[PDB]
Short mmCIF file of N, CA, C and O and ligand atoms in Angstrom, two decimals:
data_model
loop_
_atom_site.label_atom_id
_atom_site.label_comp_id
_atom_site.label_asym_id
_atom_site.label_seq_id
_atom_site.Cartn_x
_atom_site.Cartn_y
_atom_site.Cartn_z
N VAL A 1 66.83 62.54 189.97
CA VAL A 1 65.72 62.19 189.06
C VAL A 1 66.17 62.33 187.62
O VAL A 1 67.23 62.90 187.35
N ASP A 2 65.40 61.78 186.71
CA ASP A 2 65.71 61.84 185.30
C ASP A 2 65.46 63.24 184.77
O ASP A 2 64.72 64.03 185.36
N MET A 3 66.10 63.55 183.65
CA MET A 3 65.94 64.85 183.02
C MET A 3 65.21 64.68 181.70
O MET A 3 65.36 65.49 180.78
N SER A 4 64.40 63.64 181.62
CA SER A 4 63.62 63.37 180.42
C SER A 4 62.23 63.97 180.57
O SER A 4 61.65 64.49 179.62
N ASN A 5 61.71 63.92 181.79
CA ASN A 5 60.37 64.44 182.07
C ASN A 5 60.41 65.92 182.44
O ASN A 5 59.37 66.57 182.57
N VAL A 6 61.61 66.46 182.60
CA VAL A 6 61.79 67.86 182.96
C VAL A 6 61.70 68.75 181.72
O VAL A 6 62.03 68.32 180.61
N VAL A 7 61.25 69.99 181.90
CA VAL A 7 61.21 70.94 180.80
C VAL A 7 62.02 72.19 181.14
O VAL A 7 62.58 72.84 180.25
N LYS A 8 62.11 72.51 182.42
CA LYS A 8 62.86 73.68 182.87
C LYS A 8 63.55 73.39 184.18
O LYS A 8 62.94 72.90 185.12
N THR A 9 64.83 73.70 184.25
CA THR A 9 65.59 73.51 185.47
C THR A 9 66.31 74.79 185.86
O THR A 9 67.08 75.35 185.08
N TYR A 10 66.04 75.27 187.06
CA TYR A 10 66.66 76.49 187.55
C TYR A 10 67.82 76.15 188.47
O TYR A 10 67.75 75.20 189.25
N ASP A 11 68.89 76.92 188.38
CA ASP A 11 70.02 76.77 189.28
C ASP A 11 69.82 77.67 190.49
O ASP A 11 69.62 78.87 190.36
N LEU A 12 69.87 77.06 191.66
CA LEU A 12 69.60 77.77 192.89
C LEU A 12 70.87 78.35 193.51
O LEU A 12 71.94 77.75 193.42
N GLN A 13 70.74 79.52 194.14
CA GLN A 13 71.86 80.16 194.83
C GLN A 13 72.35 79.29 195.99
O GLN A 13 73.48 79.42 196.45
N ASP A 14 71.46 78.42 196.44
CA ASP A 14 71.76 77.50 197.54
C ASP A 14 72.72 76.41 197.08
O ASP A 14 73.36 75.75 197.90
N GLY A 15 72.83 76.23 195.78
CA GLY A 15 73.67 75.18 195.25
C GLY A 15 72.87 73.97 194.83
O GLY A 15 73.41 73.01 194.29
N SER A 16 71.57 74.02 195.11
CA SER A 16 70.66 72.98 194.69
C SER A 16 70.13 73.28 193.29
O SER A 16 70.49 74.29 192.69
N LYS A 17 69.29 72.41 192.78
CA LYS A 17 68.80 72.55 191.42
C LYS A 17 67.38 72.01 191.33
O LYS A 17 67.12 70.87 191.70
N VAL A 18 66.47 72.80 190.82
CA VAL A 18 65.08 72.39 190.77
C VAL A 18 64.72 71.97 189.36
O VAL A 18 64.87 72.74 188.41
N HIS A 19 64.27 70.74 189.21
CA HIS A 19 63.93 70.22 187.91
C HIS A 19 62.43 70.30 187.73
O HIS A 19 61.69 69.47 188.24
N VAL A 20 61.99 71.32 187.02
CA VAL A 20 60.58 71.55 186.80
C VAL A 20 60.13 70.79 185.57
O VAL A 20 60.59 71.05 184.45
N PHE A 21 59.25 69.84 185.78
CA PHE A 21 58.88 68.92 184.73
C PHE A 21 57.75 69.49 183.88
O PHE A 21 57.19 70.54 184.19
N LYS A 22 57.43 68.79 182.80
CA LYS A 22 56.54 69.30 181.76
C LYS A 22 55.13 69.59 182.28
O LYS A 22 54.45 70.47 181.75
N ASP A 23 54.70 68.88 183.31
CA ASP A 23 53.38 69.11 183.89
C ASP A 23 53.31 70.47 184.58
O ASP A 23 52.23 71.01 184.82
N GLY A 24 54.47 71.03 184.89
CA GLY A 24 54.52 72.30 185.59
C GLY A 24 54.89 72.12 187.04
O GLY A 24 55.09 73.09 187.77
N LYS A 25 54.97 70.87 187.46
CA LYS A 25 55.41 70.54 188.81
C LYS A 25 56.92 70.46 188.85
O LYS A 25 57.55 70.07 187.86
N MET A 26 57.50 70.80 189.98
CA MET A 26 58.95 70.91 190.06
C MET A 26 59.51 69.94 191.08
O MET A 26 59.08 69.91 192.23
N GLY A 27 60.49 69.17 190.66
CA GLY A 27 61.13 68.24 191.56
C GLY A 27 62.33 68.86 192.21
O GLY A 27 63.31 69.21 191.54
N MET A 28 62.25 69.03 193.51
CA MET A 28 63.33 69.62 194.27
C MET A 28 64.43 68.61 194.50
O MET A 28 64.21 67.56 195.10
N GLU A 29 65.62 68.91 194.00
CA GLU A 29 66.74 68.01 194.11
C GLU A 29 68.02 68.83 194.13
O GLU A 29 67.97 70.06 194.03
N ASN A 30 69.14 68.18 194.30
CA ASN A 30 70.40 68.87 194.13
C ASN A 30 70.85 68.70 192.68
O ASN A 30 70.28 67.89 191.95
N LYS A 31 71.85 69.45 192.26
CA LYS A 31 72.30 69.42 190.86
C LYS A 31 72.84 68.05 190.45
O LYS A 31 72.97 67.77 189.26
N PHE A 32 73.16 67.22 191.43
CA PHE A 32 73.67 65.88 191.15
C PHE A 32 72.52 64.91 190.90
O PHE A 32 72.72 63.83 190.35
N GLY A 33 71.32 65.30 191.32
CA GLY A 33 70.16 64.45 191.15
C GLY A 33 69.94 63.54 192.34
O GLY A 33 69.40 62.44 192.20
N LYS A 34 70.37 63.99 193.51
CA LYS A 34 70.12 63.24 194.73
C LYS A 34 68.93 63.84 195.45
O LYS A 34 68.85 65.05 195.64
N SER A 35 68.02 62.96 195.84
CA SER A 35 66.74 63.36 196.42
C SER A 35 66.94 64.30 197.60
O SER A 35 67.54 63.93 198.62
N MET A 36 66.46 65.52 197.45
CA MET A 36 66.59 66.54 198.47
C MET A 36 65.22 67.10 198.80
O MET A 36 64.56 67.71 197.97
N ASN A 37 64.81 66.87 200.03
CA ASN A 37 63.45 67.15 200.47
C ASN A 37 63.34 68.57 201.02
O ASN A 37 64.22 69.05 201.73
N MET A 38 62.25 69.23 200.68
CA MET A 38 62.01 70.60 201.12
C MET A 38 60.55 70.81 201.49
O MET A 38 59.65 70.48 200.71
N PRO A 39 60.30 71.37 202.68
CA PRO A 39 58.96 71.73 203.14
C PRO A 39 58.44 73.00 202.47
O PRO A 39 59.15 73.65 201.70
N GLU A 40 57.20 73.36 202.78
CA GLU A 40 56.59 74.55 202.20
C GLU A 40 57.07 75.82 202.89
O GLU A 40 57.32 75.84 204.10
N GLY A 41 57.21 76.89 202.11
CA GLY A 41 57.55 78.18 202.66
C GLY A 41 58.99 78.55 202.42
O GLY A 41 59.42 79.66 202.75
N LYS A 42 59.74 77.63 201.84
CA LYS A 42 61.15 77.85 201.57
C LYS A 42 61.34 78.67 200.30
O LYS A 42 60.77 78.34 199.25
N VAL A 43 62.13 79.72 200.39
CA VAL A 43 62.39 80.60 199.26
C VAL A 43 63.58 80.09 198.44
O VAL A 43 64.72 80.09 198.92
N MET A 44 63.31 79.65 197.23
CA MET A 44 64.36 79.25 196.30
C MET A 44 64.65 80.37 195.33
O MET A 44 63.85 80.63 194.43
N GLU A 45 65.76 81.05 195.51
CA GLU A 45 66.14 82.11 194.59
C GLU A 45 67.10 81.56 193.54
O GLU A 45 68.15 80.99 193.87
N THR A 46 66.71 81.69 192.27
CA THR A 46 67.52 81.19 191.16
C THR A 46 68.72 82.10 190.93
O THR A 46 68.87 83.14 191.59
N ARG A 47 69.58 81.73 189.99
CA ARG A 47 70.74 82.55 189.65
C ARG A 47 70.31 83.87 189.00
O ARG A 47 71.12 84.77 188.79
N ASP A 48 69.02 83.96 188.68
CA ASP A 48 68.45 85.17 188.10
C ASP A 48 68.07 86.14 189.20
O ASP A 48 67.89 87.33 188.97
N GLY A 49 67.95 85.62 190.42
CA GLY A 49 67.38 86.39 191.50
C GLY A 49 65.88 86.17 191.58
O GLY A 49 65.14 86.99 192.12
N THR A 50 65.44 85.06 191.01
CA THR A 50 64.03 84.72 190.96
C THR A 50 63.63 83.90 192.18
O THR A 50 64.15 82.81 192.40
N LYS A 51 62.71 84.44 192.96
CA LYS A 51 62.25 83.78 194.16
C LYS A 51 61.08 82.85 193.87
O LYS A 51 60.00 83.29 193.48
N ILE A 52 61.32 81.57 194.04
CA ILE A 52 60.29 80.56 193.88
C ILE A 52 60.07 79.84 195.20
O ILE A 52 60.97 79.15 195.70
N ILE A 53 58.90 80.01 195.78
CA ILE A 53 58.59 79.41 197.07
C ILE A 53 58.04 78.00 196.89
O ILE A 53 57.08 77.77 196.15
N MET A 54 58.68 77.05 197.56
CA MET A 54 58.17 75.69 197.65
C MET A 54 56.82 75.71 198.35
O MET A 54 56.76 75.94 199.56
N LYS A 55 55.74 75.51 197.62
CA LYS A 55 54.41 75.52 198.22
C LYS A 55 53.85 74.11 198.27
O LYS A 55 54.44 73.18 197.71
N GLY A 56 52.70 73.95 198.92
CA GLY A 56 52.06 72.65 199.06
C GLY A 56 51.69 72.00 197.73
O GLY A 56 51.25 70.86 197.69
N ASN A 57 51.88 72.74 196.66
CA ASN A 57 51.63 72.24 195.32
C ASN A 57 52.92 71.77 194.66
O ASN A 57 52.91 71.28 193.53
N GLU A 58 54.04 71.92 195.36
CA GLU A 58 55.34 71.70 194.74
C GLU A 58 56.32 70.93 195.64
O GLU A 58 57.39 70.55 195.19
N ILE A 59 55.96 70.69 196.90
CA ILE A 59 56.92 70.14 197.86
C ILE A 59 57.27 68.67 197.58
O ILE A 59 58.45 68.31 197.52
N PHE A 60 56.27 67.83 197.40
CA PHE A 60 56.49 66.40 197.36
C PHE A 60 56.43 65.84 195.94
O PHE A 60 56.65 64.65 195.72
N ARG A 61 56.16 66.71 194.97
CA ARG A 61 56.01 66.28 193.59
C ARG A 61 57.35 65.83 193.00
O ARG A 61 58.08 66.63 192.41
N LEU A 62 57.65 64.55 193.18
CA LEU A 62 58.89 63.96 192.70
C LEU A 62 58.93 62.47 193.04
O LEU A 62 59.14 61.63 192.16
N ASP A 63 58.70 62.17 194.31
CA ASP A 63 58.83 60.80 194.83
C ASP A 63 57.89 59.83 194.13
O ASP A 63 58.24 58.68 193.89
N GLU A 64 56.70 60.31 193.78
CA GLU A 64 55.68 59.47 193.17
C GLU A 64 56.17 58.86 191.86
O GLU A 64 55.81 57.74 191.51
N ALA A 65 57.01 59.61 191.14
CA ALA A 65 57.56 59.15 189.88
C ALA A 65 58.72 58.19 190.11
O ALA A 65 59.00 57.32 189.28
N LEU A 66 59.36 58.33 191.25
CA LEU A 66 60.54 57.54 191.59
C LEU A 66 60.14 56.13 192.01
O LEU A 66 60.99 55.24 192.14
N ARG A 67 58.84 55.92 192.20
CA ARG A 67 58.32 54.64 192.66
C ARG A 67 58.21 53.64 191.51
O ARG A 67 57.89 52.47 191.73
N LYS A 68 58.46 54.12 190.30
CA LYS A 68 58.38 53.28 189.11
C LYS A 68 59.23 53.92 188.01
O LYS A 68 60.26 54.54 188.31
N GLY A 69 58.82 53.78 186.76
CA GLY A 69 59.54 54.44 185.68
C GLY A 69 59.83 53.54 184.50
O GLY A 69 60.98 53.22 184.22
N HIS A 70 58.78 53.12 183.80
CA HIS A 70 58.94 52.38 182.55
C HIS A 70 57.69 52.45 181.69
O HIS A 70 57.60 53.26 180.77
N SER A 71 56.70 51.61 182.00
CA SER A 71 55.50 51.53 181.19
C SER A 71 54.47 52.55 181.66
O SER A 71 54.32 53.62 181.07
N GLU A 72 53.78 52.20 182.75
CA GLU A 72 52.79 53.08 183.39
C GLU A 72 51.68 53.50 182.42
O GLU A 72 51.74 54.57 181.81
N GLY A 73 50.68 52.64 182.29
CA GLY A 73 49.54 52.95 181.45
C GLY A 73 48.32 53.29 182.29
O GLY A 73 47.22 53.48 181.76
N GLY A 74 48.52 53.36 183.60
CA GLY A 74 47.45 53.66 184.52
C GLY A 74 46.92 52.41 185.19
O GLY A 74 45.94 51.83 184.67
CU1 CU1 B 1 62.24 73.87 197.01
#
């Protein structure tokens, strides 16, 4: 995914990378930006030792943006 809509990205001990966008929703991906899908209940520990659980509010928030990406006025 793009890193234009992201505001915070954590590096995961798993080797993946979560791009948390400005809305507060986080797009689960790998550090290369290849779509990596994750269900709810998964513990993502950052390089800080910060445990962030993929919840039903965070699992699929990514694909919807990938369906377009230019104008979008509603
Ligand atoms: Cu995740």
